[PDB]
Amino acid sequence: VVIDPSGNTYYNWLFCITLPVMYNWTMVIARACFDELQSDYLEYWLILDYVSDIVYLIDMFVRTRTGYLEQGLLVKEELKLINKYKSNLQFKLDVLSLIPTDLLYFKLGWNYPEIRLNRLLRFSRMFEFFQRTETRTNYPNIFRISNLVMYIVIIIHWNACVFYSISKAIGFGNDTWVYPDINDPEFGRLARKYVYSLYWSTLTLTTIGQTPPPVRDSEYVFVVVDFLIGVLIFATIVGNIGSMISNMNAARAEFQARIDAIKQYMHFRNVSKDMEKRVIKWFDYLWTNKKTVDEKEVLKYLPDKLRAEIAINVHLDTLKKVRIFADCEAGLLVELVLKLQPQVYSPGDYICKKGDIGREMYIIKEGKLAVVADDGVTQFVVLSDGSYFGEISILNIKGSKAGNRRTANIKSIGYSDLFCLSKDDLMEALTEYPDAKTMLEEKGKQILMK
Amino acid sequence: VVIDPSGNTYYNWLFCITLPVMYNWTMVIARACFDELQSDYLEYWLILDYVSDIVYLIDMFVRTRTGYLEQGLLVKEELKLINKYKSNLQFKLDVLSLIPTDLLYFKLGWNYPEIRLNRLLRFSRMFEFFQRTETRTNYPNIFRISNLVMYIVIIIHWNACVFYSISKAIGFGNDTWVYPDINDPEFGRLARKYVYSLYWSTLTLTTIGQTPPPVRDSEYVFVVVDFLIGVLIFATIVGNIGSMISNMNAARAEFQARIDAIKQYMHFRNVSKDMEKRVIKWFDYLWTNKKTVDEKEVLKYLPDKLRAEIAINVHLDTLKKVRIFADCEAGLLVELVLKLQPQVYSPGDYICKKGDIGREMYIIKEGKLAVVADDGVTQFVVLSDGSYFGEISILNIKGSKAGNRRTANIKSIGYSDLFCLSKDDLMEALTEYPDAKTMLEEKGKQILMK
Amino acid sequence: VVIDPSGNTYYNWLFCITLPVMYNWTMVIARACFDELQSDYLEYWLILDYVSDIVYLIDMFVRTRTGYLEQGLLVKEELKLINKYKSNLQFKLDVLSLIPTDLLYFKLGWNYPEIRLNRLLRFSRMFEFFQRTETRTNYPNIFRISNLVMYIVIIIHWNACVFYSISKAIGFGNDTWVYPDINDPEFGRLARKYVYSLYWSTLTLTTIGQTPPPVRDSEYVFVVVDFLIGVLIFATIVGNIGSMISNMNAARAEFQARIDAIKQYMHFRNVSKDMEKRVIKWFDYLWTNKKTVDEKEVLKYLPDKLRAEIAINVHLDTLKKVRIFADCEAGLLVELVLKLQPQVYSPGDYICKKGDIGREMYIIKEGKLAVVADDGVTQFVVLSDGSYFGEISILNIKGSKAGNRRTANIKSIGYSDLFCLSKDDLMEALTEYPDAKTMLEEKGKQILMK
Amino acid sequence: VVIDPSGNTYYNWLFCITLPVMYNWTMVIARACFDELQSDYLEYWLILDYVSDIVYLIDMFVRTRTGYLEQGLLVKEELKLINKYKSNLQFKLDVLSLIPTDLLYFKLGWNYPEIRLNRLLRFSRMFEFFQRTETRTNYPNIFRISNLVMYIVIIIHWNACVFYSISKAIGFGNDTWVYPDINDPEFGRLARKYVYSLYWSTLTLTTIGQTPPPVRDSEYVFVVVDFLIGVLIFATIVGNIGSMISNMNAARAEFQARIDAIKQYMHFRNVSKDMEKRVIKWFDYLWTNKKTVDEKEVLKYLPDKLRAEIAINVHLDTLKKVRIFADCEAGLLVELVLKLQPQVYSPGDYICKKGDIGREMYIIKEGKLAVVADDGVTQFVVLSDGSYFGEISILNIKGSKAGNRRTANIKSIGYSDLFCLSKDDLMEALTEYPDAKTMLEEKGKQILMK
Numbered sequence A, B, C, D: 001v002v003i004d005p006s007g008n009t010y011y012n013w014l015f016c017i018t019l020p021v022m023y024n025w026t027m028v029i030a031r032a033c034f035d036e037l038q039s040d041y042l043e044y045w046l047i048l049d050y051v052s053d054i055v056y057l058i059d060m061f062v063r064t065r066t067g068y069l070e071q072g073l074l075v076k077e078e079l080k081l082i083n084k085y086k087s088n089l090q091f092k093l094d095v096l097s098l099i100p101t102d103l104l105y106f107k108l109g110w111n112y113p114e115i116r117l118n119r120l121l122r123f124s125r126m127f128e129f130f131q132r133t134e135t136r137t138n139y140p141n142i143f144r145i146s147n148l149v150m151y152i153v154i155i156i157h158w159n160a161c162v163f164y165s166i167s168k169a170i171g172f173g174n175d176t177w178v179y180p181d182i183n184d185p186e187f188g189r190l191a192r193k194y195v196y197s198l199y200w201s202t203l204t205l206t207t208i209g210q211t212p213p214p215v216r217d218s219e220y221v222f223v224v225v226d227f228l229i230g231v232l233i234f235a236t237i238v239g240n241i242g243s244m245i246s247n248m249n250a251a252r253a254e255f256q257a258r259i260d261a262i263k264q265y266m267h268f269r270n271v272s273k274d275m276e277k278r279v280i281k282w283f284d285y286l287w288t289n290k291k292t293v294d295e296k297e298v299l300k301y302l303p304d305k306l307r308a309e310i311a312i313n314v315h316l317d318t319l320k321k322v323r324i325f326a327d328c329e330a331g332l333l334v335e336l337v338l339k340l341q342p343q344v345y346s347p348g349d350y351i352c353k354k355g356d357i358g359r360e361m362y363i364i365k366e367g368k369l370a371v372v373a374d375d376g377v378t379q380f381v382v383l384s385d386g387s388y389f390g391e392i393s394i395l396n397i398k399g400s401k402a403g404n405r406r407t408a409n410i411k412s413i414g415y416s417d418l419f420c421l422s423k424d425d426l427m428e429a430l431t432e433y434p435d436a437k438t439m440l441e442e443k444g445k446q447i448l449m450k
């Protein structure tokens, strides 16, 4: 065997089947409308159509060999897959899109390729590929815009073909509106035919309407309907363009809107230009160093038993340098990684101060912190990455003259990325295995006596 | 009896009255402006107008026979309904729209059907039908787009009629702007008249303006006003189109935006392509198997005493296979169905692990789980649908060497849809009837000894 | 005083000063550009300009006599108000807009009314009136759309005047782009002048561009700049139109989106058409009876000491029929009115059932409820409006064989609007005055014995 | 060293390098396409190009001398900065944009300035400056709109240059579509050349299309592609304009939407016009006095150890007049400034009333309050700014006949801005230093006895 739709093989086949479906959606109508296209390159159209039909057949086979999830397990029983396929509307659409209507080439002649129009009924495969690509691609907005542009181009191409067909029905050159006479040297070339039809279609669907006005009632009606199709469908698509660009700007726009609200508040309250500059510097840091997004709000949509792995694969850089995690229990790190709230501190920010509520443990992910003196400048100890502080005031200790108080003040030399671990959480998670707690308050007593 | 507006009969009548109202809103102005329309098909217009008026009268009768809610009860007293009708502005509008202005046909002649313009004053019924359909239809966006297209078409039709009337007032063919001379063979046909007027209206309201420019001051003024009506009203309607398409994409766009934020985080943090593939697979599963929507956020707008029924009608498939619910008390299932949080687990995800906080009971809705050994591969027990686990570590038990600990580790073979029932909730809800609890810890002791 | 800007007198004056400001913003540029406008109606323009200037002077006086809030109190000291006025930029703008530039009529002649262009510098007053109207009017969206249309019209009018002025500078009729020769009988009329200039402006600002193309470099540059002004500013304004219509649809669109999510869930889960019809009926009820909006989310932006008054003025209809409120303490009703959560129940919905957690007291605002038998049909007692139930299981009672249990089952005959009062809240709020509690458990014992 | 990108020097250099990048992005294509531009002002183009290249070199030097943050510290080691520069793609782009392609002037002649097209590869610097300006400027929306207008102008300019180049390739005047013959006196001027090309570009990119239609297939194709570029890219940019105006209106629109929901509720519930006027007055006050924004929601994105400084720099005006803060401990004010919830009370609003739950302490930021008698009018004490009340009922006091009760009723004479400090918070924060608490209940006893 089976293909496992989640796999890469299924996605690759989705591409390989979208190619014929897109080809069919673009060219069947073109060949049906522009007769010279069908006739001049008939030897190539036959090859391409037969290849497309072969790929359609192989796609039907793949649909027979693609497993589905019952009880969460991939069904691998062949006949069960055949039944699941045939019971779905997709099998009906596939049989309809693979009906050998090409036999009508013997009745209607080689000049009627619209018999292959049923081949469009595999559009679903194409759309599936798109909805898969949009999910799996690393450039979701680039692909989304390319998809919208493809839709625009297909719509304009189809409307060009429709215009040319209507000109044919009315008669080429019978009036100033229809496509001019084919017998003209310049206006008889297939290139000119298609490109002028596309020009007309673009002027109509984009509602520019710089083309010769209608003469007959059918022409007036078609032009009204087509200008309305233009207005509505092009507003739809080119406003989807707008929404895609909006969601492209979503993060940056939200960040900038927050900054603007802050600046409005500061200018209204006449906040000192010192503090205004400090705030602007904080936000410039958040942007430049790519910290505007908070991983919590993003990863909250992941499963906890997958977001856990995510956090591990991101923070194993530092949670191996820490003494508590991955050293004593070697598994405890998972119990708290999904609750280590990542904080960022500016240079000179006092994370801790003597005589404060010690309700948070900190793990230094990045940055240089200092166990300073209360004078403000004298740096007693420099804590680099992997260090952990703020854990002594969490625990119950014998001989602690300072209970629930910070034993020292910790300031940040530079921008520090820390993991604030709350006291309640450390309490709750160390209950399972105190084999790490013993050396934890080993460190605790050792630092509390000195 | 009375009609009970909530019923299907009332909605069917809403359709049957919207038909004449829509007919009146489309055709009265057309016949008033295009005199040949009124004259040539007068025998049909008379029949249709009289049928419309009869339906208007029957709609007034229905309004007299439609109950309203006082004290939440449907008023069935006839005279009370007559008073409620006559006291409402709707009765005034109905009498105004049913005034026999057709008598003016004897004074103004058969060429003045705008006397029936008062018939437009039942627009409310039409709109009511729409606002009912949008609520009750299964295709809300299809109907909404059809409604907007109907508004566009009606506006363009009315503007076409207005253009033709203005041409008539100025005189057909008196200058290049107005509709050409009626005496022309081609430009005198009612078909050509209406269709060219519609063409002009479309070019003007869609602000394409490819029509002959104004010559007189009245023409310049009307064209300015009409181009502005075009800009404003068509932006309104065709931006409502945009918002409707947006809300069509709302679920998919939110899902894809979450996936994009996740992928941005993973690529920025250089998350391993293993875990990136796992996350993409999780999201592909959520989409393909239609799990992107969380029933909680959707059904939270339902009444609890209706959302309860909803959850029952959805989850009675599994809550009959469970041993606790619908078996001992047979009513307890409602006390917890509105708090069974549905979770989804990937293949191989450890739902439970030995030596963890047993604070959640799980009911396997769909999927195969395994009571494995801690080695990781040896599957002791396979739990299929209807099974419940994680309930032993909830309860107070005699002789439990493992208190508040998982007696075994449960992993998911495939994608498991479970119902996580919190410990606090099971505690709170079993307090009412311990007739099920006794066999609950029957199972508990039986599994805790073996 | 003083005038007290919050008062109605200040708003009326805002209108009376917006009239000259709007007049000045519309007509000064018109008279400056269309010389015939200035000249032909000079006797009227002089009167209107002098009246506008008098009103400007009276507006300056009002600004001297309008109090401001210092320490939250309206300043009534005259000289303090004069200082507050003169210290503001508004005084500078007012003196600039009232500078007697009309004296230049003696130097530049009566054909130069753009000397009155400084009169536009009172635009602020106009805008203030708008921002006041939008706040105080009952039709905020009608006024907002009218304001946007006024901006569109003013912009188009100004661009028409600019086009005519540029034609004058280049010379009327010197090329096909500029306004045609004034000496023409038809193209020399002030009506034709202004209306064709407005036509050109509309075709340009709405980016239709169906006007004679530029001939000179200045004309090309102006047309480029004006088409870009068109694109940008008209997108701005006519997209503000879109956002205004969106916020017009905001409530209805949110309601309908909730209904659509519900219907999607129900159709996906194959919810029985019984329950689907019940849900659709619930939502039809919510809409038809105007219950889609929840007063909590709306009134949460009001002050509690004003939202309290709001809730009182709305619910004194029923909280006078209740026995506890406004009867014993006569002031207790305010302590709980801001926490009476309004619920709606469908016909047949069991609000209470025997043997359930009695943690909510209910006050029947509207609707008929029944104290039924557990059989389901036998109605023991019918509770109409003003009745209160679910209070016995809240209180501590002697001789209650049923503790924390519902003494009877309450069902809703029809759609009941109730006030669910939580047990914790009744406990917390009755602590202040048990003078009502005594008769409360009077009723309690009386019903618990029978 | 180093430059410290957060500093003002780096931003100034960002401007000084954006000037050549913008110059290059505007003029290289212009000179490449309009040959007369390159030739006539070659002496000036050479100077400007060499100055631009010198500034590019100095920008490369700056990039070598700009520190980056490792461990949150600004790297000042020269060679480390050289490595960080050369290891980034920016160094590749800078070397590519500074390659001396001007040497090709000796081969291709002075008429080929597109060899300087590589100079566009420093676009990043320009964009960086923009993203810095948008952050640091006080007019974010003005700058954003200016940036979008710059993008529009650059796109139109580039498309004008492209049109002129295509006309050159096809041949000037070979058909009606291309730019006319250069040999024409009027259509040969560089001014006319560029300005008509810009006119064509504007008519095409804004999809007005009032220019001579295509004649050749290449012209038709280019016009189709360019009209589509117009539609898509101009919708993008001029809808970004819409979103920028939306976020300009965001605060005012949210405020007005809240007011509209309130007014809809009041008119639907038939709220008395007294209370409707009171609510409208409250909202008029909120707007006029600039209180629609709540500093909590804005400043919650700031760091707590920066939002603290913000609140201090804003509220030190009053927290120096208070007796508790900045007087006894002199540091306690920071422990509670981030939890002082700012409330606003209308004139006559009873903040406190005798016999109520004293769970909030109030600090009068602005406004006159009264310790009144319960009669309602007799004002015992007038509390101005700096005063604090509601603190007696917080504390545990000996001899308090009124426990957890308000000792008096406090009403607001005028609009009072207060700081509501919750009881729990005062309890929690005074635990650290009771040196202020002693005089706190000094005041407490002193007022409780009298």
Ligand SMILES: Nc1nc2c(ncn2[C@@H]2O[C@@H]3COP(=O)(O)O[C@H]3[C@H]2O)c(=O)[nH]1
Binding pocket: A352, A358, A371, A380, A381, A388, A389, A390, A391, A392, A393, A394, A405, A406, A407, A408, A409, A410, A447
């Ligand atoms: N007092 C003290 N604290 C230190 C030293 N080195 C690291 N620390 C950390 O500084 C922290 C300050 O807050 P805590 O008292 O909670 O915990 C303290 C220790 O974790 C040291 O040498 N002396």
Ligand SMILES: Nc1nc2c(ncn2[C@@H]2O[C@@H]3COP(=O)(O)O[C@H]3[C@H]2O)c(=O)[nH]1
Binding pocket: B352, B358, B371, B380, B381, B388, B389, B390, B391, B392, B393, B394, B405, B406, B407, B408, B409, B410, B447
């Ligand atoms: N230990 C054990 N647990 C089982 C077995 N079969 C099912 N389970 C479930 O596995 C669950 C693991 O978590 P709990 O200990 O809370 O509850 C356990 C039982 O509900 C079994 O055979 N042995």
Ligand SMILES: Nc1nc2c(ncn2[C@@H]2O[C@@H]3COP(=O)(O)O[C@H]3[C@H]2O)c(=O)[nH]1
Binding pocket: C352, C358, C371, C380, C381, C388, C389, C390, C391, C392, C393, C394, C405, C406, C407, C408, C409, C410, C447
């Ligand atoms: N048992 C009983 N309850 C009644 C009667 N009339 C009204 N009620 C209300 O029905 C309510 C059901 O819930 P509670 O027991 O909390 O409170 C009960 C009473 O408030 C009655 O006649 N008998």
Ligand SMILES: Nc1nc2c(ncn2[C@@H]2O[C@@H]3COP(=O)(O)O[C@H]3[C@H]2O)c(=O)[nH]1
Binding pocket: D352, D358, D371, D380, D381, D388, D389, D390, D391, D392, D393, D394, D405, D406, D407, D408, D409, D410, D447
């Ligand atoms: N009773 C009384 N209260 C006063 C007086 N002056 C100020 N107050 C304040 O009024 C407040 C009312 O609420 P509290 O009793 O909590 O605290 C009271 C005091 O803080 C006074 O003279 N008498």
Ligand SMILES: [Ca+2]
Binding pocket: A207, A208, B207, B208, C207, C208, D207, D208
């Ligand atoms: Ca257009």
